[PDB]
Design a protein around this ligand. Structure first.
Ligand SMILES: Nc1nc2c(ncn2[C@@H]2O[C@H](COP(=O)(O)O)[C@@H](O)[C@H]2O)c(=O)[nH]1
Ligand SMILES: CC(C)Cn1c(=O)n(C)c(=O)c2nc[nH]c21
Ligand SMILES: [Mg+2]
Ligand SMILES: [Mg+2]
Ligand SMILES: [Mn+2]
Ligand SMILES: [Mn+2]
Ligand SMILES: [Mn+2]
Ligand SMILES: [Mn+2]
Lengths: 324, 328
């Protein structure tokens, strides 16, 4: 027997796949997983990351995620673990430099840092200190990003301490671009840009590759439904918990309420059907043009999830045919 | 030619008239007098009337804006007054009230006043290279200008300074979005991008097209911000000294901290003439030329002074070079 934070060989192997059960593990075990990713991706080797600083940095990242129902440390773990899965699934180390892999992973981990559990529309409408600070420009994502680099600026947490300044600047710019790209209000703009590049994709074109990295981090961020139904499903309850908290607050503060956060309108099936059909499937279809193996491993579960939720909605609707 | 003497902050009729033109001598006035001028602009432009601005709040607001400008050699309360006063001048010269809604004039005037709030006296490149708290906060994206705009709205969120308190929320959102766009447009890193976009619309300008009008307003605030050389020589010249003072302070600090130094800020390489010639010829003149296509009255009033300053500085340099050659 070994202290939980000693990962088993079985767990290490399972960690490479999108079927990994994100719910089984406590934070200390999740931190060890993330640690293992940096070593296993060769990032510790190639960026001379102090192994103790890596751990201190992950602990500090954990400390700066809030205990929200959804936008919490377990979410950043999911996003990073899906990114790690996609590196193996899509053979990303053939296409991307080690600096690009470092940017993808570190941005995945950092992308929702210190999230308050109320979205940008709330920040903007309530004129919060964050909205005022960032002039209504992706306030949350600007904040996640600032926090990321505030953490990295503390020497005991600086995993980049042994990278030259030019390397740091290159990584910094990449991470900012990616975390900013996680603002869903930009989803159609980013998808349109990507598809435009996808007309004639060029792996040696830097602009093409920046858009590919933004699509990968976006894929991983919104990827919960790619996972086995038993892993995916509790995430929806968590999300609706945050949505309903926000809309309750908006009501009692006299602010606009989004219909997709309305307790009397929204169900799991209504939340997921449109999202899978019109956001997730189309994005993964376009990625599958570059990476055909994504169809079987990620698009198949989405088709299955779509169909299950359509069945669910049909029974939810019937149940309400009994209620007035 | 009044009958008795009045406190300085009671503007004379002569001052009120002179205030409408780009020849206004910005150096004659103490802070309290400049505040009275700004106040007069809001009343005279009909902004107090059309937006139900409490006149006492307007004063409190202007005083709080003044308090939040730092005592920098160049990026100080007097500079904001210059930019605002040039904007006021351009409203009359270009008859902007025919083209623009009152909401638009409000955005232009208020952005002008607020555009350099709490400037630290070191530019974005310093912020970014030094990895300052501003640079980290704003993720290297126009850190100063984001900050100016944040401070503007921090002031406006205090009820005693909220000149927009009687504006409905939909009005506030429209005004806020416009001020943000304008203040962010003053980052000189974006100069060629904004000019290119504007020139593109200029191929077939449309005053009813909202994207065209947004770019026009961006060009207008940019014009006013860098408009010092449009002013009479005696008014314009001491501002060059102020600017170099900030530039040399920065390059001194960067040399000490081991950070990169920009040649245009290097006290070993820069003159008044050197500083201004290229800036006038290749930044100012071309920008005011594009504006003249929409507002041909701009040529006489604003390009002519720029041509004169260009020529005067080219002569100063020619003389500086003859001195150097004589010694070296
Ligand atoms: N309806 C729905 N929205 C999701 C799902 N996963 C993520 N999202 C939305 O996409 C956003 C991604 O941004 P982030 O999680 O980085 O704030 C989430 O905040 C959430 O609003 C999902 O499974 N269903
Ligand atoms: C153009 C830039 C490199 C230097 N620069 C500037 O930004 N502003 C605003 C000036 O007024 C100015 N005058 C000389 N150089 C200047
Ligand atoms: Mg987010
Ligand atoms: Mg400025
Ligand atoms: Mn915490
Ligand atoms: Mn997220
Ligand atoms: Mn002050
Ligand atoms: Mn300025």
């Amino acid at each position: 027997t070994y202290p939980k934070y000693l990962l088993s060989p079985e767990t290490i192997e399972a960690l490479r796949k999108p079927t990994f059960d994100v719910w089984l593990w406590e934070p200390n075990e999740m931190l060890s997983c993330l640690e293992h990713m940096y070593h296993d991706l060769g990032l510790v080797r190639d960026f001379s990351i102090n192994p103790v600083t890596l751990r201190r940095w992950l602990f500090c990242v954990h400390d700066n995620y809030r205990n929200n129902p959804f936008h919490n440390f377990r979410h950043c773990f999911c996003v990073a673990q899906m990114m790690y899965s996609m590196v193996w699934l899509c053979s990303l180390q053939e296409k991307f430099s080690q600096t690009d892999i470092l940017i993808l992973m570190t941005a995945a981990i950092c992308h929702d840092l210190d999230h308050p559990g109320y979205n940008n529309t709330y920040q903007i409408n309530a004129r919060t200190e964050l909205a005022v600070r960032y002039n209504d420009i992706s306030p949350l994502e600007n904040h996640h990003c600032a926090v990321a680099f505030q953490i990295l600026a503390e020497p005991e947490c600086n995993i980049f301490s042994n990278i030259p300044p030019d390397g740091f600047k290159q990584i910094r710019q990449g991470m900012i671009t990616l975390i900013l790209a996680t603002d869903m209000a930009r989803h159609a703009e980013i998808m349109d840009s990507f598809k435009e590049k996808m007309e004639n994709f060029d792996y040696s074109n830097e602009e093409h590759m920046t858009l590919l990295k933004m699509i990968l981090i976006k894929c991983c961020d919104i990827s919960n439904e790619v996972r086995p139904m038993e892993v995916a499903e509790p995430w929806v309850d968590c999300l609706l918990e945050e949505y309903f908290m926000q809309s309750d607050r908006e009501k009692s503060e006299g602010l606009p309420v989004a219909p997709f956060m309305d307790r009397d309108k929204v169900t799991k099936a209504t939340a997921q059907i449109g999202f899978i059909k019109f956001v997730l499937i189309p994005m993964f279809e376009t990625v599958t043009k570059l990476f055909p193996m994504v169809e079987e491993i990620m698009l198949q579960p989405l088709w299955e999830s779509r169909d299950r939720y359509e069945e669910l909605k049909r029974i939810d609707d019937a149940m309400k045919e009994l209620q007035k």
